[PDB]
Design a binder for these strands. Structure first.
Ligand SMILES: [Mg+2]
Ligand SMILES: [Mg+2]
Ligand SMILES: [Mg+2]
Ligand SMILES: [Mg+2]
Ligand SMILES: [Mg+2]
Ligand SMILES: [Mg+2]
Ligand SMILES: [Mg+2]
Ligand SMILES: [Mg+2]
Ligand SMILES: [Mg+2]
Ligand SMILES: [Mg+2]
Ligand SMILES: [Mg+2]
Ligand SMILES: [Mg+2]
Ligand SMILES: [Mg+2]
Ligand SMILES: [Mg+2]
Ligand SMILES: [Mg+2]
Ligand SMILES: [Mg+2]
Ligand SMILES: [Mg+2]
Ligand SMILES: [Mg+2]
Ligand SMILES: [Mg+2]
Ligand SMILES: [Mg+2]
Ligand SMILES: [Mg+2]
Ligand SMILES: [Mg+2]
Ligand SMILES: [Mg+2]
Ligand SMILES: [Mg+2]
Ligand SMILES: [Mg+2]
Ligand SMILES: [Mg+2]
Ligand SMILES: [Mg+2]
Ligand SMILES: [Mg+2]
Ligand SMILES: [Mg+2]
Ligand SMILES: [Mg+2]
Ligand SMILES: [Mg+2]
Ligand SMILES: [Mg+2]
Ligand SMILES: [Mg+2]
Ligand SMILES: [Mg+2]
Ligand SMILES: [Mg+2]
Ligand SMILES: [Mg+2]
Ligand SMILES: [Mg+2]
Ligand SMILES: [Mg+2]
Ligand SMILES: [Mg+2]
Ligand SMILES: [Mg+2]
Ligand SMILES: [Mg+2]
Ligand SMILES: [Mg+2]
Ligand SMILES: [Mg+2]
Ligand SMILES: [Mg+2]
Ligand SMILES: [Mg+2]
Ligand SMILES: [Mg+2]
Ligand SMILES: [Mg+2]
Ligand SMILES: [Mg+2]
Ligand SMILES: [Mg+2]
Ligand SMILES: [Mg+2]
Ligand SMILES: [Mg+2]
Ligand SMILES: [Mg+2]
Ligand SMILES: [Mg+2]
Ligand SMILES: [Mg+2]
Ligand SMILES: [Mg+2]
Ligand SMILES: [Mg+2]
Ligand SMILES: [Mg+2]
Ligand SMILES: [Mg+2]
Ligand SMILES: [Mg+2]
Lengths: 263, 158, 134
RNA sequence: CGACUCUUAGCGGUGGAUCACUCGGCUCGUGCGUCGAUGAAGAACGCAGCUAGCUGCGAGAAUUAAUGUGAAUUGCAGGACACAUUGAUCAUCGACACUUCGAACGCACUUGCGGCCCCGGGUUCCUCCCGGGGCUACGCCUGUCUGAGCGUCGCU
RNA sequence: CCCCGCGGACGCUACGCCGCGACGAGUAGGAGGGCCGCUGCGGUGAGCCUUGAAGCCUAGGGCGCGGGCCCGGGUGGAGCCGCCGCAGGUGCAGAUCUUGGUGGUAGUAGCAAAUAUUCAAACGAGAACUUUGAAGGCCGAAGUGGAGAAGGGUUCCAUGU
RNA sequence: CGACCUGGGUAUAGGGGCGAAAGACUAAUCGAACCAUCUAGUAGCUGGUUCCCUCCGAAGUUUCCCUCAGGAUAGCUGGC
RNA sequence: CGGCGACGUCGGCUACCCACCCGACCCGUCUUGAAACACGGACCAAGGAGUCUAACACGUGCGCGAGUCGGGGGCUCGCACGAAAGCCGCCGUGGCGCAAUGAAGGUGAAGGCCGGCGCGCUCGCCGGCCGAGGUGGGAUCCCGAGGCCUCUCCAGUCCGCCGAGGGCGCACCACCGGCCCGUCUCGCCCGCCGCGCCGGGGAGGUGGAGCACGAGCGCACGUGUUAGGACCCGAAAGAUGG
RNA sequence: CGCGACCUCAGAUCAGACGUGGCGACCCGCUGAAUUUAAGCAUAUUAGUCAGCGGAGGAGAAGAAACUAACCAGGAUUCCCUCAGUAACGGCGAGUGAACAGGGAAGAGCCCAGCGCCGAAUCCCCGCCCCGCGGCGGGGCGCGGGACAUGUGGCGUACGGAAGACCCGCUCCCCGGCGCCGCUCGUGGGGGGCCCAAGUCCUUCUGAUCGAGGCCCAGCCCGUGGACGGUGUGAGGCCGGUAGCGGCCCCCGGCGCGCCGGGCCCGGGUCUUCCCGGAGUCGGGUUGCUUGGGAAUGCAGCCCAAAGCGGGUGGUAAACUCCAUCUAAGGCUAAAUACCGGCACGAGACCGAUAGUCAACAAGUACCGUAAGGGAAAGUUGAAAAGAACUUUGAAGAGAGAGUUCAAGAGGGCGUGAAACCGUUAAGAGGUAAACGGGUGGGGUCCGCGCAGUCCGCCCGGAGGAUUCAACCCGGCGGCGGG
């Protein structure tokens, strides 16, 4: 808010022997404003309590290792059909969830061939869902230029822009992302992992030298290696059903002993 | 009032600091502006090195940093004298010169004259009038080999 | 979408420009589509509405196939008065009902030197667009 | 049985909360970064066919010219406007114009009064009256002209 | 070595479900939970909506210990909400609180300083109050008279409402 | 009939004026005018401090303090 | 097991009005004590008060880990989003941590077992090993006599469970030693391109926010304290210029 | 005993110029508090801050060492990170508090006086002639004035410089135009003007729709354009726009070549001989302020008052000594940096009419005060005025009819239209003021598709239908297992 707001009144308190509250009052006469409370957060036309200031620390810094970790997690979750379906991305006729297309997509020029590619990749139903989800936002965002809202479509991840950006980008929901400049804000749109991602073959191949293997470090990040699991086998059902675990157990106590009515 | 164990704190906020607060919301804009100015300057001095004149090898002063070597302000007059470059001609071919720096030992002097000689060998001097080359360079090498060097000229390494 | 950093997408700014537009660009704002026959005859789609050309109302209460000549272009209220787009008021006199020019189609153009120049300029720009996009 | 009073509900008032709207703000950022004796900022008074304010303008006064545009302006009226022996409106704005105070400048002001030089009229050149035009502030630099000094000297 | 039957409830959002035992005061104060509530942002609901959004009203039907919520009817006329996260100028009975509105008081106090009015007529929808006439009174020339300064600034004068 | 009353014009301006003196008067303000700002001045003092349920639950005592309407300190409390 | 069931009745403890019995003083607040003859409150609507920054402390979550952190800069068509994100590594400069102690000059954290030698003179020249000592507790883990089995016994095949005792002992705690810096007391040696008013060493007390096989760094969140208008409203005053 | 020259002064409405005042967010020079904190308060703090005065510019100021250091040295200024809440200051209390080195942004250097040499080589003005105008310059002439030896210009400035020799290298400067490029540049350099894709298709909802369903050929059409706004609803295709190294037209500006008109004059190296510097200033004393600067950091007043192998600094006063480092008392200078005023833009996890600026509106307005100054309230008919013709009562306000509209139960302070409060109607009640908790009862309004009251699994019986039930054959697809 303005640092001057509510404080350009020259108002002073009336004292205490005048049967009014001791709030400052506007001076002078001849106008409605005269004798009215001023400067207070409780006063109409006064200053708000603790006025908002521009040095609010709007920005946060996150460790680079944390940010790389989040990118790796989002990429790993984008290859599991349960998580992408749970983000709601209509991957039902998609032939393969890590969906990789040939490099010639990068040189597309018209939007017609981008639409045709999505139709033939069976990713068009997600675009249709975005179309169905276009509606007006509720609240003051309409007054503040966020008038229309829609859901997120597939993310096209490319290696080189030979026209693919212009071929897409008129399809609602589509966001195009360079493989070398992966963004967590686009890979996990709402903070939830599992966005549908379509990879160009060049990007898919560069991915292994970009974040590295577990047995070789990344060649394009100079200190990064993939993070380690604290649980190699997360199949709790298999682990419990395993004979070695079952040999060590005592027998289950599955009989219920309810309260005995004391006769 | 102090409360149990703690650190005796002395905040320097007794002096109406809220009138003099420097926010940094123009930092990305400043980075863009400086980057654009750098690009424009590099375009302006078209084949000349973008970073600027070659700087000398200089040892950092105190006992904490004297094991380290950095780039200096300019080549000394003694260095230019024993390298054979006029002090008023060096600044036109892109050699920075510091008239107030002396040389206390011969090893630094010799390292910097070897630096000057290597730079002078690496230089491609265009003729003043392109049609008529007086003593600048051969057109065969200056037509192809002339490109704008990026980064510092012969960066100083430890 | 819009990429030019010097044209605004702010709703308040766009509305302010629209409602405080000077009349010489209110003329641009008050353009009408040509009929299909006119859009085939000239390679143009739209045309600023003019005092003495005849239109058909295509939306609202007065829509129909009836051709009516424009009798007024009231740029202050962003409306046009057409010949039979009218109603009786209380005392029995007839008053024109203004409608937006975007809700009419121009069937015949009031043709003069300036109109012909604008028509050929628009057609030439459209043709260079087609040959660029060939 | 009515009145009266209380509670609740329907309707009607009083009031303007709520909600929805927003040509307004606030905040951040960018690019420029330009006033004035050739008279600024500010003020006053005027100016429209009907006009008080706001806005615009200056006795050429809600505007002239020029250029771009290309048929309106509009609340009413009026009359334009072959749109080519050129054009409504609007925009732009480089030509022209720009009342009185104001640093404010002939002197002075809560009023008023000069002086000088030209021009026209009554005069019917001589200087009175009227009108028009141009000058008439302070400080200061360079130069010019006119000077002052029992200042320092030269010659007689 | 199950087989004339080929068959056999539910469960286990593991942050879930089940069992058993004891216990339950509370200011100042602390903590936890909130599928309590408000506003905005990122996701999501192939969400809702002119065949009717928000808001408001309601002797309507209910749910929850509660904060509150859902549904019916009316009015209204254009936008709104659920879930997962994020962010606050986020919840009022008080502050002789701020601004706005409204009561009782109350058809009450009051419209009581300087003697005083009355008759007839006219105009007019309408007359205690206007106008004319008649009468009775007052100011009583240090005036309730006739003119100015300061101040006001059109109040001056006609015509009309 | 007088140290008389009074108009207008002038002069004196705030820690200053003016006072036949009452701390009187100085634009309904005077034992220090009014206006704006420093200024959201400071307050150990008064008033207020906005949703629900569940669980736990005090102190008015010790020592030191220009300390006695306040603090620090130990105690008592809650949470992890 | 019985009765009753459409224009009159059936059920609906909630919700509207009314009646009766019992109970019931007006809230907020300061206070030992408020219904108070204590203060504020006529009524209704809307607004209205622990906030943000910085700095600490501890707790919690995350990443990396003797390291960690790019926050300032730079590179990537300059820019819908994007003022975002990504990258740098001879951009890690630097910060914090990894070393303490003394006013400072300065100094600065490894010991134990087994041998021959001086005199194994409370000990100096070596050797060999091992690599932060020991005592008492100590989760967990290891061994384990002896038992628990089938239709039965003379005789071994493979492992499961209980198990008195015994062992290695995490973290942590108490204690005893040891080491580093300061400072006292005592005392005898050693070193040399500077033989010195030089330098080094030992034993015994004692001062240190120390060592003794690191735990930190960055980010986020909570709480508490503090400087700021500082939860909100409130002086009498003081100053500057008019 | 006048005329001249100079010096020092004066006047002029003399010829031609220049300053003043405003804005003031940022910047430079001064001046300069108190509230406040210290739980009192005087030093301290607030704070070299507010207020006051002066002066600028698009930036300003600063700035090319009388520097930092003590090292194997760095090298103008300014800004960022860090140094560092540190060294230090401080009733050593509260509190205050830099710098160097290091890493970066940027980077650029120079000119006089003096000492000298060169016949004042120099400058201004006025005339006349030519080339020009776009901010008034070039060239030429003047027995034309003036300035200036009480010092103009050229060389030259601490990094040394000059002059002579000897040797070596000819190497090529800056201005204003004629025609034309690369068309200037992340693909126009800038300003302005006009233009450039695609549904108003079919059926329907509505007052109106931009709504809903559909549009065979893999799907209505365009999409480098699905930003936004308008339009009677909520629109990629109705309109303006949006995208585009899209188009056309006009104007402006610095970039190379041949020529044009003028200026345009020798550079380096070695040796020899010469020449070298800023004074009421430094420095010292004392006083006052200021700083982290502490036996005195800086500034200023007064007094004293220099030197030249000197002088300054070397963070503890002084003497001696060595060393290091710079060269004061003259001047200029871009960039990085600042910007709550101005011109023009863009944006937002902000506010949404008691909010957000005081001001969404004829707001610094109305109004108040003598003045300085103080300073509001106040948004919404409807898609369209279609803003209610006409009849009727009344003097009119105001009504009853009628009419417009989807709606006037939208009627000019007119979207919605809460509560408090009030009127009327309906029901109920009423001598312990109302109101309240618990428990019932009565009445009332509504709810229950209440009104002969649930379904469904198997079996039995009866009365009927129909493919076909099992098992085999063919084919397809899955689950499991396979040395
Ligand atoms: Mg406000
Ligand atoms: Mg809402
Ligand atoms: Mg650089
Ligand atoms: Mg009502
Ligand atoms: Mg004109
Ligand atoms: Mg007079
Ligand atoms: Mg004389
Ligand atoms: Mg109990
Ligand atoms: Mg309890
Ligand atoms: Mg609040
Ligand atoms: Mg209230
Ligand atoms: Mg309360
Ligand atoms: Mg009465
Ligand atoms: Mg009376
Ligand atoms: Mg009488
Ligand atoms: Mg009189
Ligand atoms: Mg007295
Ligand atoms: Mg106060
Ligand atoms: Mg004491
Ligand atoms: Mg008390
Ligand atoms: Mg109280
Ligand atoms: Mg008491
Ligand atoms: Mg009480
Ligand atoms: Mg009592
Ligand atoms: Mg009392
Ligand atoms: Mg009290
Ligand atoms: Mg009250
Ligand atoms: Mg009261
Ligand atoms: Mg409220
Ligand atoms: Mg970044
Ligand atoms: Mg380092
Ligand atoms: Mg132990
Ligand atoms: Mg010990
Ligand atoms: Mg603490
Ligand atoms: Mg306060
Ligand atoms: Mg005081
Ligand atoms: Mg003159
Ligand atoms: Mg000035
Ligand atoms: Mg104090
Ligand atoms: Mg105090
Ligand atoms: Mg005090
Ligand atoms: Mg100031
Ligand atoms: Mg400057
Ligand atoms: Mg300077
Ligand atoms: Mg120098
Ligand atoms: Mg530190
Ligand atoms: Mg200070
Ligand atoms: Mg000279
Ligand atoms: Mg179009
Ligand atoms: Mg629309
Ligand atoms: Mg649209
Ligand atoms: Mg365009
Ligand atoms: Mg010393
Ligand atoms: Mg307001
Ligand atoms: Mg409202
Ligand atoms: Mg009336
Ligand atoms: Mg309606
Ligand atoms: Mg209404
Ligand atoms: Mg009622």
């Amino acid at each position: 808010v303005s640092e001057l707001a509510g404080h350009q009144t020259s108002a002073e308190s009336w004292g205490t022997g005048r049967a009014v509250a001791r709030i400052p009052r506007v001076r002078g006469g001849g106008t409605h404003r005269s004798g009215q409370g001023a400067f207070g957060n409780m006063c109409r036309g006064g200053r708000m309590f603790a006025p908002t200031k521009t040095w609010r620390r709007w920005h946060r810094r996150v460790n680079t290792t944390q940010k790389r970790y989040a990118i790796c997690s989002a990429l790993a979750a984008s290859a599991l059909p349960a998580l992408v379906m749970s983000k709601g991305h209509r991957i039902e006729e998609v032939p393969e969830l890590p969906l990789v297309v040939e490099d010639k997509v990068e040189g597309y020029k018209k939007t017609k061939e981008a639409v045709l590619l999505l139709k033939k990749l069976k990713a068009w139903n997600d675009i249709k869902k975005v179309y169905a989800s276009q509606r007006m936002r509720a609240g003051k965002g309409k007054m503040r230029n966020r008038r229309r809202i829609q859901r997120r479509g597939p993310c096209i991840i490319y290696n080189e822009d030979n026209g693919i950006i212009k071929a897409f980008r008129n399809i609602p929901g589509i966001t195009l992302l360079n493989v070398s400049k992966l963004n967590i804000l686009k890979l996990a749109p709402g903070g939830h992992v599992g966005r549908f991602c379509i990879w160009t073959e060049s990007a898919f191949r560069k991915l292994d030298e970009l974040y590295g293997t577990w047995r070789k470090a990344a060649s394009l990040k100079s200190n990064y290696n993939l993070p380690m699991h604290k649980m190699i086998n997360t199949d709790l059902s298999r682990i419990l059903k395993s004979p070695e675990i079952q040999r060590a157990l005592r027998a289950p106590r599955k009989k219920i002993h309810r309260r005995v009515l004391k006769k | 009032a102090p409360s149990r164990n703690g650190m005796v704190l002395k905040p320097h906020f007794h002096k109406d600091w809220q009138r003099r607060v420097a926010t940094w919301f123009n930092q990305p804009a400043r980075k863009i502006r400086r980057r654009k100015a750098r690009q424009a300057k590099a375009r302006r001095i078209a084949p000349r090195p973008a970073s600027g004149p070659i700087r000398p090898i200089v040892r950092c002063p105190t006992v904490r940093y004297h094991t380290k070597v950095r780039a200096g302000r300019g080549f000394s007059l003694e260095e230019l004298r024993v390298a054979g470059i006029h002090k008023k001609v060096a600044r036109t071919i892109g050699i920075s010169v510091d008239p107030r720096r002396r040389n206390k030992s011969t090893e630094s002097l010799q390292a910097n004259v070897q630096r000057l000689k290597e730079y002078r060998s690496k230089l491609i001097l265009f003729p003043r009038k392109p049609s008529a080359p007086k003593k600048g360079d051969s057109s065969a090498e200056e037509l192809k080999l002339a490109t704008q060097l990026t980064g510092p000229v012969m960066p100083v390494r430890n | 979408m819009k990429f030019n950093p010097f044209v605004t997408s702010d709703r308040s700014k766009n509305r302010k420009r629209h409602f405080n537009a000077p009349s010489h660009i209110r003329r641009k704002i008050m353009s009408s589509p040509l009929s299909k026959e006119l859009r085939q005859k000239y390679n143009v789609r739209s045309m600023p509405i003019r005092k003495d050309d005849e239109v058909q109302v295509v939306r609202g209460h007065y829509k129909g196939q009836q051709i009516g000549k424009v009798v007024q272009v009231y740029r202050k209220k962003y409306v046009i008065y057409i010949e039979r787009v009218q109603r009786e008021k209380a005392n029995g006199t007839t008053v024109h009902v203004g409608i937006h020019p975007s809700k009419v189609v121009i069937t015949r153009l009031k043709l003069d030197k300036d109109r012909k120049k604008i028509l050929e300029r628009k057609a030439k720009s459209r043709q260079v667009g087609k040959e660029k996009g060939k």
